[PDB]
Structure 1
Amino acid sequence: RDAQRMNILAGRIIAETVRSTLGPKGMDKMLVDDLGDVVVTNDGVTILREMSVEHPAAKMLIEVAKTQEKEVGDGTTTAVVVAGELLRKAEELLDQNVHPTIVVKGYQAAAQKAQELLKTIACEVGAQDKEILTKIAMTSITGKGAEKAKEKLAEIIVEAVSAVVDDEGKVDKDLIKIEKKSGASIDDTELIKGVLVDKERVSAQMPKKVTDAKIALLNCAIEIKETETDAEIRITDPAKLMEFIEQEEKMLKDMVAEIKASGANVLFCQKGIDDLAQHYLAKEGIVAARRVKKSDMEKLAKATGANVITNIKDLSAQDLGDAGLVEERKISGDSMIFVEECKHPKAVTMLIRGTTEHVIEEVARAVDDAVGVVGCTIEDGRIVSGGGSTEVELSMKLREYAEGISGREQLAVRAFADALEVIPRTLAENAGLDAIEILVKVRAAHASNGNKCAGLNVFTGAVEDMCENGVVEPLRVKTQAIQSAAESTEMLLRIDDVIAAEKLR
């Protein structure tokens, strides 16, 4: 057989698994492999990476899906769930002797037509009105499941992205670091100007507070030095045992002398430190940490101005860093080092605590997406009321435009319009209310001169004003998802040649 239907049907099976996960209180499945590791997550990207595929034509949809994950993060499920509807409606078109080429031309024309529509519906907002940045945050956090400490978590994120606003009006997501650590509860979240180092000093005799501390970036294991060649040192006489081991320690004082004379105050070693070396740095009063992974040496260098140094026998003052305060307090038992710079805080760090390891993990995945969804708005300054209301408005005006196009092309244009009403349908069944009935009332609000912010509320269950409640999203999550759906639908309608090759490289 031609096996042409097996391609369009292969993608629908993958959409049903994710269609049920779309929504605030949407359930999830668990397709664990033959290993035994059980795990559940309310995210469409976590299942695709683990879900297996049997046919080779079920991979292009996963590759394109990962593109939006590294740009906005949220909104990938809305593109794969809607694409499956175009394939289902396409089956009805093939019955009427319609070639796929005529269907592809309708999506490309309808997709581009929806671009200019979203630009006119989007309103303008300010670049500093904090009141506008508060509603956009909770709109995405409440959907993930965090009805405990949301009124305060949104204020810790909006204040962090607003402080890292460069002169060109841009925001970066790498400068914001996250650290997970179980503690008292989630309310312990607090904003910090500097960066934290989850380590404890090896001596409580260090200065409690120091102003204008010069960072000394170290990149050498503070241990006994040995020749690279195969040649050990045999000790025998009771007198020769205090030379080969003592002379090596004298080099540390000579090394610290050059570092101390340059105005140094602290130090951070990438590797561990010898047990005997911890006694001299304590009795003499020298601040220094042990084991600093590469992930930390980078942020601590560019932030404080320090540069990477390979040779320690020439650490001049120009190579040292710069900071404002270096305090190390104890909380919840363990302690942490602080490295702030009030002169020019070019980076920030937000610590998160929790009671169980599962809580700190879920909340850690939302802080990285919340800073991205709001970053695009600060740079663009345009938002559109979401809540399943943007697609409802397109299903009313696009129908009138179909009358202009004549011939056998208007069939494909209308097929794309009636396929967008599936998003609010899933939200209806998730709340336990009928869909075909409520869809008759939602259209009454958008009759003609009615408001353009009417949407369904899963909480109350009645049509209300989505603008006053706090349901709003940017304009890039919609145009990108709709554009990605049309760009991926052609991969199933244009393909046809499927020869069983061998060793194609």
Structure 2
Amino acid sequence: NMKRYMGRDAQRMNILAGRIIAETVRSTLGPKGMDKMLVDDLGDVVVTNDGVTILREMSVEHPAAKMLIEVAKTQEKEVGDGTTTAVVVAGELLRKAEELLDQNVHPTIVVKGYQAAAQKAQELLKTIACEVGAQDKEILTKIAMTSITGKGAEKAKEKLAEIIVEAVSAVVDDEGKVDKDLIKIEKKSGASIDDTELVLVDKERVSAQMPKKVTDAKIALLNCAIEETASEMLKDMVAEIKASGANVLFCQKGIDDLAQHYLAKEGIVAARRVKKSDMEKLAKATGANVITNIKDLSAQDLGDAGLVEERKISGDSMIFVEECKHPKAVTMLIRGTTEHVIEEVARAVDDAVGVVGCTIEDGRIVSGGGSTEVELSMKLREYAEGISGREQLAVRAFADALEVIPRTLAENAGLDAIEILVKVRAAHASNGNKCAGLNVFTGAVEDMCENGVVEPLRVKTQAIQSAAESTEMLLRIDDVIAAE
């Protein structure tokens, strides 16, 4: 009772389960990559190329397959971009492992070489990484351009990348990290995509008596109700909010009609029945605390916004909580034709903000298009030469597994994956180039540094470490116990 596989039947069962879900997202990789349509139980339709969004919301039930959905989940959490690359590598590390397992090479000798090679791979990517001065805006534009590319070439327009860099360099708290929460994202309609210019609550003001737009507003987020009868029992409740010094008031519950007069009598603007999702947004953006008791409302529990304005944007009158000047907080009015386009243009900026923010924090970038994958592969095979024992073959299989990304890039491009794999490999020997990679549009092998195809070092370093540590643990299983 109830389900168990023995030794060889357990090792092959776990390796096959990791490889089968890896091939599902193997075609999505590359500028000429494929998209996936997922239809669940509800009949809800969604089409996505992003590797992490596919694995999370689709029906997966195999025990070994569920463990590999933690690699991409910690890839989007730590980096964001490179969720597809982190899964495919892990699949190839299982393919090169079972080739050694059938030859009676012990799994512990395999895990001995796999860890030692991954320990060396991290201390080899450091040299081949180029240093990008934190405010070198011409390179930062290229890094942002490389991030928008991959989701679409038509999305990658010269003017869009210039806007993103200006926002990230402004929100840097000297010295000198980058907080991604400081940039506010707004999703509005209107014939745009190009009209995109450098929290939005779907509500109005509780009374027409209240004014419309402050400068340097203090926002009190109340979870508790400000309620009553007919005997001015709210004059205390209104004065308690005035005691803290908050001119803006976001209430999650209902505000009574008597309190509406008194809050407007002071000059304080209030909003009734704001969605619970929007209340959690306001607390983290402005730096506010959600208070569930009006008696204990403190002045240090209030958030700080730059510009609060009830604009009638796209017809609807909504509360524009953003804003600043010499600004530590920036708002991005991401706009497009249909809401489904807007959300995609919103997620495209999410990756573009991350890479520029990572470049400022680190300094660091590596050549994309399967360029640094070849350089690291040839440097680890010569590293394997100086290792005595059976653990050498594990390092050799680790290095031969690194050539999967440049191989799969040709698989989805149209060109032969066997011919180019030799052309780039020969163009890495001795010295040059280190930056030589495959350009899917041109066809021939080109220098990626001059093409503008660059990705942050964290995209490659995290993806290797997350895939290595996962495959090391998966090769340490010989018995599977699955009840029910």
The TM tier, using the shorter chain, reads 0.7 to 0.9
How much does 1:393 deviate? 0.8
Alpha-carbon distance between aligned partners in 1 of 2:466 and 2:287, rounded to the nearest angstrom: 41
Residue 278 (structure 1) shift: 6.1
- Shift of the alpha carbon at 1:72? 0.7
Rounded to whole Å, the distance in 2 between the matches of 1:408 and 1:321 is 61
Residue 55 of structure 2 is aligned to residue 48 of structure 1: yes
**Which moved further from structure 2: 272-281 or 434-443?**
272-281
In the TM superposition, what is the alpha-carbon distance from 1:403 to its structure 2 partner? Answer: 2.4
Which residue in 2 is equivalent to 1:491? 473
Q: CA separation of 1:413/1:252 partners in 2, compared to 1, >3 Å: closer, same or farther? A: closer
> Secondary structure of 1:288's match?
strand
1:447: Cα distance to partner? 3.1
Secondary structure of 2:39's partner?
A: coil
**Structure 1 residues 305 and 344: alpha-carbon distance in aligned structure 2, compared to 1, 3 A threshold:** farther
Q: CA deviation at 1:263?
A: 6.9
Question: Retained in 1: the 8 A contact 2:324–2:330?
Answer: no
Aligned pair in 2 of structure 1 residues 463, 409: CA closer, same or farther (>3 Å)? Answer: same
How far does residue 394 in structure 1 lie from its aligned partner after superposition? 1.9
Pick closer, same or farther for the CA change 1:495–1:306 going to 2, 3 Å: closer
Q: Would the alpha carbon gap of residues 289 and 34 (structure 1) be closer, same or farther in structure 2, given more than 3 Å must change?
A: closer
- The structural deviation recorded for 1:389 is 0.3
For the Cα contact (< 8 Å) 1:149–1:186, is it kept in 2?
no
The C-alpha deviation readout for 1:223-271, integer Å capped at 9, x for no partner, is 4xxxxxxxxxxxxxxxxxxxxxx97363446755676698764433333
* Alpha-carbon distance between aligned partners in 2 of 1:499 and 1:316, rounded to the nearest angstrom: 54
The alpha carbon displacement at 1:296 in A equals 4.7
Aligned counterparts of 2:174 and 2:346: Cα–Cα separation in 1: 29
**Cα distance, 1:285–1:55 mapped onto 2, change above 3 Å:** closer
Q: CA deviation at 1:120?
A: 1.1
Matches within 5 A, 1:92-103: 92-103=99-110
* Stretch of structure 1 that moved more, 314-323 or 139-148: 314-323
Q: Aligned partners of 1:62 and 1:341: how far apart in 2? A: 38
Offset of residue 106 of structure 1 = 1.9
Cα offset, 1:43, TM superposition: 1.5
5+ unaligned residues in a row in structure 2: which ranges?
1-7
- Structure 1 residues 143 and 252: CA distance shift in structure 2, 3 A: same
Percent of pairs with identical residues: 99
Q: Secondary structure at the match of 1:179?
A: strand
Which segment drifts farther, 427-436 or 209-218? 209-218
| Aligned-partner Cα distance in 1 for 2:359–2:323 | 28
Q: Is the 8 A contact 1:184 1:332 kept in 2?
A: no
SS in 1 for 2:318: strand
Seen in structure 2, the aligned counterparts of structure 1 residues 431 and 253 have a Cα distance that, compared at 3 Å, is same
1:49-93 deviation per Cα after TM superposition (whole angstroms, max 9, x unaligned): 233345423332223432222111222321221222233233433
State which of 338, 343, 353 in structure 2 corresponds to 1:361.
343
Question: Using the alignment, how far apart are the partners of 2:42 and 2:246 within structure 1?
Answer: 53
| Cα 1:218/1:419, change in 2 over 3 Å | closer
Larger-gyration structure (1/2): 1
> Contact 2:439 / 2:445 at 8 angstroms: preserved in 1?
yes
Question: Matched residues in 2 for 1:412 and 1:273: separation?
Answer: 67
Change (3 A) 1:323 1:372: closer
- Equivalents in 1 of 2:333, 2:432: separation in Å? 45
Q: Are 1:173 and 1:368, in contact at CA under 8 Å, matched by a contact in 2? A: no
Aligned residues: 477
Between 363-372 and 459-468, the greater mean CA deviation after superposition: 363-372
Determine if contact 1:200/1:334 at 8 Å carries over to the other structure. Answer: no
Q: Distance in 2 between matches of 1:323 and 1:492?
A: 48
Contact 2:10 2:478 survives alignment (8 Å): no
8 Å contact from structure 2 (residues 365, 454) kept in 1: yes
Change (3 A) 1:452 1:250: same
Distance 2:395 2:193 in 1: 49
**Structure ranking higher in strand proportion:** 2
